[PDB]
Amino acid sequence: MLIVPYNLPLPGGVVPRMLITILGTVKPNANRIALDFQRGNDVAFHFNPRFNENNRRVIVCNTKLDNNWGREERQSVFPFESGKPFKIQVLVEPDHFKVAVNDAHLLQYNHRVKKLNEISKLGISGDIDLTSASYTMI
């Protein structure tokens, strides 16, 4: 019910206490999903489930500055399943983005991009049916 890739404007950027909620369903034969919190052409926070990286499922997080990817942060907890509905919650906290999937804490990602108020778009892409994408202040 939303078209992927989908752009969600974040007006005035992000700020601590801002909660972003993404609902959708992973496609049957999924390979990849990405959420990109963007500051212009930079990617402040890339959140990238890979369903088949050398026959392993991994989430890769990173930042893109001046077209260059930095040091990846990985982990092995992988809550997504092909064919199944998911909820991703991204809570902006003072020193990191905090991600929970299906109401279970997954990971945190320390802020590398410091101008939070310039992180003004969220891109959602890859092998999903996207139901909804929104934000609220908690």
Q: Which residues contribute to the annotated binding site for a beta-D-galactoside? A: 69-75
Closer residue to ligand N6B (CB): 39 or 46: 46
- Residues 6 or more apart whose CB falls under 8 angstroms from that of 68 comprise none
Token pair 């906290």: residue: 93
Q: What is d(CA 130, CA 60) in angstroms, rounded to the nearest whole number?
A: 20
Contact status: 25 vs ligand N6B (CB under 6 A): no
Q: What is d(CA 90, CA 81) in angstroms, rounded to the nearest whole number?
A: 19
Least Å from the CB of residue 47 to ligand N6B? 9
Q: What residues line the site for Cl ion (CB under 5 A)?
A: 4-5, 113-117, 125
Q: What residues line the site for ligand N6B (CB under 6 A)?
A: 32-34, 46, 48, 50, 53-54, 60, 62, 69, 72, 125-126
